[PDB]
Structure 1
């Protein structure tokens, strides 16, 4: 698998139950579900994961489980990130408080209150970064934002991940 040995840094406690595994560190703590069909418990300078048998159930949960951990470990030593370009004429983004107010050509601007564990930046007025401890959450909010006014599909309008798009070379017209 990608069940290599992980690598615990600086100030991360890695607790472990039969079903779960807590990860503390400088940016926060995270609870991480785990198949009790694997036996991990608070391990050394690095975290390792084995599986009993080489059945398919098992291999699948391995790596799945190692990555879930590993993402948790990178979360707590600053794993925020992934940012949004808004592209197109009247479209721009500002913060009002901690909440995020995109104007994207609908009749009223939309605001997006950020959930717990998650922080919005707006360095430029058309770049926007979502920042959190978790990861899957960063992803989720990334997408909810994106899906407010998705690209494209005939134009360089809408709001994009940084990582880029096709256009449909359409009726001019």
Structure 2
């Protein structure tokens, strides 16, 4: 229950507040969160918080978003994130090529993906792939594009699946 919540700041994480933006430099790396100036950043060592100036809908909204968002950021520079994908479909798989990730999921050609900056493509197997990095949204963004490449199949388990993505396919012939 969420802007109410306090955001712990387990070092080594340098929560640097700027006007309308924070700069958090954790062990895993660094980033900056641009933030609404209307919301205060309660910069306390160990746990930082946010104080919504009123309780309008915009301020509970921006309060929860700012709090949970910056918490995601510090958890980013402090731990980074991961989002796996269980590539399915017979003969469908991938393999990292340096930084760029080759993926072949049944086209007239393979498909290569380039990690943007931190973004790494872990290839546990050709069938499963990890995409990790400090960013929480960006992992879901690049991995999002990955699943967008070969979406799930409605009639067969043949498509790029998220880890934990519940496989619901309808019957066919």
Distance 1:164-1:139 versus aligned 2 partners, 3 A rule: closer
Q: Which moved more, 1:21-30 or 1:161-170?
A: 161-170
Deviations 1:24-62 (A, max 9, x none): 011111110111001215323210111111111111100
Structure 1 segments (4+ residues) deviating >2 Å: 41-45, 164-171
- Identify the structure with the greater strand proportion: 2
State the Cα distance separating 1:164 from its structure 2 match.
3.3
State the Cα distance separating 1:171 from its structure 2 match.
3.2
CA RMSD between the two structures? 1.4
Q: Distance in 2 between matches of 1:171 and 1:100?
A: 33
Q: Is the 8 A contact 2:28 2:134 kept in 1?
A: yes
State the Cα distance separating 1:82 from its structure 2 match.
1.2
Q: Distance in 2 between matches of 1:104 and 1:132?
A: 24
Q: Distance in 2 between matches of 1:54 and 1:10?
A: 31
Gaps (5+ residues) in structure 2?
Answer: none
Q: Distance in 1 between matches of 2:68 and 2:101?
A: 31
Deviations 1:150-171 (A, max 9, x none): 0011111011001134444333
Distance 1:166-1:160 versus aligned 2 partners, 3 A rule: closer
Gaps (5+ residues) in structure 1?
Answer: none
State the Cα distance separating 1:66 from its structure 2 match.
0.3
Q: Is the 8 A contact 2:3 2:60 kept in 1?
A: no
Distance 1:154-1:38 versus aligned 2 partners, 3 A rule: same
Q: Distance in 2 between matches of 1:171 and 1:32?
A: 47
Q: Is the 8 A contact 1:86 1:160 kept in 2?
A: yes
Distance 1:25-1:169 versus aligned 2 partners, 3 A rule: closer
Distance 1:10-1:99 versus aligned 2 partners, 3 A rule: same
Give the count of matched residue pairs. 172
